[PDB]
Design a protein around this ligand. Structure first.
Ligand SMILES: *[C@@H]1O[C@H](CO)[C@@H](O)[C@H](O)[C@H]1O[C@H]1C[C@](C)(N)[C@H](O)[C@H](C)O1
Ligand SMILES: *[C@@H]1O[C@H](CO)[C@@H](O)[C@H](O)[C@H]1O[C@H]1C[C@](C)(N)[C@H](O)[C@H](C)O1
Ligand SMILES: [Cl-]
Ligand SMILES: [Cl-]
Lengths: 7, 7
């Protein structure tokens, strides 16, 4: 993970 | 804004 979003 | 991140 480590990313974010939101999609 | 309203979206997220983190870049
Ligand atoms: C997403 O990251 C930001 C930055 O550190 C935090 O402020 C935010 O609380 C965090 O969102 C939580 C709540 C959410 C969106 N329901 C998810 O569970 C995420 C992974 O964590
Ligand atoms: C979104 O990220 C910023 C920067 O780290 C935080 O300061 C902020 O608290 C965070 O927003 C929260 C609250 C919100 C907007 N209701 C959402 O739940 C997000 C994911 O987390
Ligand atoms: Cl949320
Ligand atoms: Cl908002």
């Amino acid at each position: 993970x480590x990313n974010x979003x939101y999609x």
